[PDB]
Design a protein around this nucleic acid. Sequence first.
RNA 1: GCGGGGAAAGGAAACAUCUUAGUACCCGCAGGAAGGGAAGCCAACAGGGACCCCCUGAGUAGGGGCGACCGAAAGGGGGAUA
RNA 2: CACGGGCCGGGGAGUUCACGGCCGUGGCGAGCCUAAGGGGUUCAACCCCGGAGGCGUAGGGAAACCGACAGCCCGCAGCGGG
RNA 3: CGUGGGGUAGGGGGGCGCGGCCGUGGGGCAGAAGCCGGGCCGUGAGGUCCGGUGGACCCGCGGCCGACGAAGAUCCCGGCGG
Lengths: 152, 121, 121, 278, 140, 155
Amino acid sequence: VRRFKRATKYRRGSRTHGWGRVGQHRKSGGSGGKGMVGFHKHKWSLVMKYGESGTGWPFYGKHGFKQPETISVEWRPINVGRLAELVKELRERGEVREEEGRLVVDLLKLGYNKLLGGGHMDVPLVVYTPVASKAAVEKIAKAGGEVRIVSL
Amino acid sequence: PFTASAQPRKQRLSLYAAPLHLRRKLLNAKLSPELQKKLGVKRLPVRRGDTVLIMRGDFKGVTGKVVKVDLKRVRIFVEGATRTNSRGQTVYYPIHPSKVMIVDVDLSDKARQKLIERRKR
Amino acid sequence: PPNPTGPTNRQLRMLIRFLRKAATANSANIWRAIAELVERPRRSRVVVNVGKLNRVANDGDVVVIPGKLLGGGELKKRVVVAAVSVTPKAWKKVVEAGGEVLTIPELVRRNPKGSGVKIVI
Amino acid sequence: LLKFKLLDLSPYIKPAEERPPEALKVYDVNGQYMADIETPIHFYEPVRPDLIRRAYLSALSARFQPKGVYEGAGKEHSCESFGVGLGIARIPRYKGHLWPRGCFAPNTRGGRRAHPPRPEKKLHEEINWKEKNLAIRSAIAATAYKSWVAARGHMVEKVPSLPLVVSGDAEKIAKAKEAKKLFEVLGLWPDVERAAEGVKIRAGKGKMRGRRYKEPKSVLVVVSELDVPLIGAVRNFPGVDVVPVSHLNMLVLAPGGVPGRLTLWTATAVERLKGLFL
Amino acid sequence: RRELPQPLKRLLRLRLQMKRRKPEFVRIDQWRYKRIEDSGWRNQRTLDNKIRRKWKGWPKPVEVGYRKPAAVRGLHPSGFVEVLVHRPEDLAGLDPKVHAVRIGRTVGLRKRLEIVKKARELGFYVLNPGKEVVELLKKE
Amino acid sequence: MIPKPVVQVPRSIKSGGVTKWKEGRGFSLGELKEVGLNAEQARLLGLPVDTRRDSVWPQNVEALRKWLIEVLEGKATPPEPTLPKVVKVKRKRGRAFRGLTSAGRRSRGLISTRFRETHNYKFKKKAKERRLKKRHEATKGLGNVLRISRIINES
RNA sequence: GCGGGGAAAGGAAACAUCUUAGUACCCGCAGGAAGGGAAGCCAACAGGGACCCCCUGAGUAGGGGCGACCGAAAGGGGGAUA
RNA sequence: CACGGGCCGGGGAGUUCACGGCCGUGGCGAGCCUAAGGGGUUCAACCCCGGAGGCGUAGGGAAACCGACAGCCCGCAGCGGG
RNA sequence: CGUGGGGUAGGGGGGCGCGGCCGUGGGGCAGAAGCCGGGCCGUGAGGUCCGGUGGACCCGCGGCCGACGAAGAUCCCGGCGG
Ligand SMILES: [Mg+2]
Ligand SMILES: [Mg+2]
Ligand SMILES: [Mg+2]
Ligand SMILES: [Mg+2]
Ligand SMILES: [Mg+2]
Ligand SMILES: [Mg+2]
Ligand SMILES: [Mg+2]
Ligand SMILES: [Mg+2]
Ligand SMILES: [Mg+2]
Ligand SMILES: [Mg+2]
Ligand SMILES: [Mg+2]
Ligand SMILES: [Mg+2]
Ligand SMILES: [Mg+2]
Ligand SMILES: [Mg+2]
Ligand SMILES: [Mg+2]
Ligand SMILES: [Mg+2]
Ligand SMILES: [Mg+2]
Ligand SMILES: [Mg+2]
Ligand SMILES: [Mg+2]
Ligand SMILES: [Mg+2]
Ligand SMILES: [Mg+2]
Ligand SMILES: [Mg+2]
Ligand SMILES: [Mg+2]
Ligand SMILES: [Mg+2]
Ligand SMILES: [Mg+2]
């Protein structure tokens, strides 16, 4: 950790304190208003640089609707390539119970609700997941494993 | 009863503003080794009629009787530790009780003896 | 902004000093290049996971990492890696893949010219 | 396993003073060599003064209290600016019989302090737990070297070796007079004697606020567990700190933020050190 | 006094010339106003500052071009390297051929006697024995 | 050691089937009848009883049975009973004037909604946050500063 | 602390809806705390289990010249537990 | 011939919090940190516990819903050959 | 090594001083702080020493923190002038 001297130490003797002589340090008129204002009149050039042309969408307007969070599912997917690491980590801790001659992984007990298809699976394994993607189920199948879909 | 706070301002506040029954404990002086063996107590607050030995200052080495005690100032007057003002009268030097050693005790007061038993015990 | 000061750690300062001497002593540009990369600002210091070593390096390669080696992905190859520092997961994954983890000063002592060493950032 | 810890920089950099010994010497209460014990892993940590300084400043900063002024100080007078045209400056002035007298502004007598200390100010410098424990191991390892302890100021000419470890029988010493012998027999008394004569009435306003005396640091005594009798026997020595090994912290291991403290470890505390701060 | 090498004898002679001709660095109108007469140099950042602009006939500004030679920079006029001393134990590690002793200003007379006797017997040039110490040792 | 009841956290639709456990309010009546006690006897022994709960968990039953054996074999000291041990009811002055009668409660909204959703609660709660400069009230306009900053940086 | 009456300045770079703010202030009424408190509840077919206060959920849902700005609740972790 | 100061002494102005961007360093690292709170302490320090939660690890779409690389080429440094 | 050496607003880099704190080393009734004059050092902020006065505190170095630096605001308070 490194420490630095404040700018106020440098500014003693400088009259204007870094604010200039012509355009000095004034009140909120020196900002263009108080708060996040002016974005449609004199800070419209800032909206035209970041937001969409014409509408200035993210600064102003509506778009679509939000599906309510109290009736929708919060998704915690895990890729099979990441899932390969987790079973190896659990295999060394003796947590995974070998039951069908393959290793059995319960995604919900781990804290995940969905299976995705990123990475590689290299061992035969049984995964219980309420949702599994198309490529995820294929890659688990190619390693000799199977996906079993459990309904909530 | 004298602050237990470690802050100097609270220590000094209790000493200056201490009531009369608490300032008596500031009159304590060391007894002589003979009187310690004669009484078994290491201290007694100085009383009028006690003989003391001055132990510091200009009158160090003088022994005399205590002619006056002041609770408000916490000073004692001893014969020999005197001087004469410009008009010629003889006046007493105020000695702090912690700068004297009680070489003789005034024990004619019956209340003083009960305090003697309390500290030897 | 506050301009780049360089590392405050003395262990990193000595290793940076060490590499520049080894470049001068052996006429090996690899050590000077490693020293420049090690001395970069803390917010842009090189970090590599062991999974990236699957791609950029093959078996028998001697790899020097001018920063931290992190444990990410799975290493299926045998490689000799030298790093500024190694996490416990990276060391375990390198060892169990058949590789071996070296300090940077150890690699210079073993290979003073750094011939055939592959820098991975 | 410690190859990245104690980095070997030869041959292009000359090596420094050697690491702590593989075995730690143990002395009886009578000051004679008795046995040898293995050095814990904490003593192989490289001494990192910047990390030690950061971890010390965090521990010290958490003890400060919030200071402030009265929220209404300089602001409760009935005052108002009387405009221009009176030939006087247009700062606020008293409204009543003290009319021309200025008021409320920072540049007026009796006015408000412009930017006073605020009680909600954050004085504590937070440190991560793993970082703070790494510094404690680092400061522990600094006590193993005679160079650091001599650099911090301690007198170690009579110290038989570092880290100084004594037998666990020292925990039964219950008197200050008995403990003073063990310091003298172990070559520790000269540094305790240094702190005694080094006490000074400090300059400035600290005398007014309860900080009249400045007392150096002499010896940190590490006992195995809380409430051993050795704690009450050594705690009166000038500069001497006595803590159980489970209560170790940066305020006793690096006073002033600088590493290297003259430490007397008991043998049992060294055994208990193997499962702490790691 | 102190025997310098020949390269360090010319610089000390040259540094004396630079000290002789060095301007005193004062703000504008420092001679006029009693409120700023005893102040140090100030490089005032103002609109009409004619000292920063180096107008001929005005006072001169502070610049690094006035710096004296680096080898003899900071030496006592006798050439020795001054070392503040606050007790006789402070005399350890001092070379009498290189270092001149300057006793600390608040060192008491009782200690200054004990410092000066030890310093004189070691061959050190003591700059400031004091009037009181000089009279006592003169009387002995 | 008194055992603590273990109940299920209510599994939400948002959770997606991930579940966890928690310390419940108290042992259910169904769990107590499998060990031979009712609510009065259980509270007398010192157990926390929740008569509202209907579910029964075997882990709750086993902890009750192991602890009950130690108590009835004199190997454990039960805590004080889980019943009211003090009755302090203060005299009420000006109930009508402080809006504590039925009409005042209806006007305040306590009949029709909860205390947390009443309007007088909302006034007091937002005032305490602003007075202390608490979580979201430490910055005014925090949502709009966040929204515009997200656009500018995530453009 | 509880109930009622109740602004404006300022902000929005003007200003009226709005905000400021159920605030300042006023009227009334208690206690050492007050108020709240014991399912015509929350949930989602799996379960919690009176109340208050703290951390969080969260500046999320939503309100709004959909501008400025405003803004929960359930749930989880605690204090305490009747 | 623009305005301010008779003189001297003392006083007199970029602060703090919250949030966001960025930098310089430090710790850990596919993970990082605990908040409230709890135990102990030589007692606001300190040691230990507390992972709730937040950020990261996966994106696209209003939403329902779906959900991802080592193949090739140019080529700085570096390395090997002349 | 440089056909290097002006510079307002502004950006960047280092240092001096003031009050306190964590360390370390010291001085002081054989005279601390402060005040008046003077020598020396430093481009400079400043440091240090000498003589007088004074009568109990203070300083060097490393680190950290601020109610931290005035010539001016028809500045504020006091004192005192032509
Ligand atoms: Mg501007
Ligand atoms: Mg203009
Ligand atoms: Mg201006
Ligand atoms: Mg427009
Ligand atoms: Mg629409
Ligand atoms: Mg005041
Ligand atoms: Mg800070
Ligand atoms: Mg002072
Ligand atoms: Mg001009
Ligand atoms: Mg003097
Ligand atoms: Mg808000
Ligand atoms: Mg306002
Ligand atoms: Mg407006
Ligand atoms: Mg208007
Ligand atoms: Mg009444
Ligand atoms: Mg109550
Ligand atoms: Mg009540
Ligand atoms: Mg509102
Ligand atoms: Mg004008
Ligand atoms: Mg005028
Ligand atoms: Mg220039
Ligand atoms: Mg200092
Ligand atoms: Mg000015
Ligand atoms: Mg005046
Ligand atoms: Mg007159």
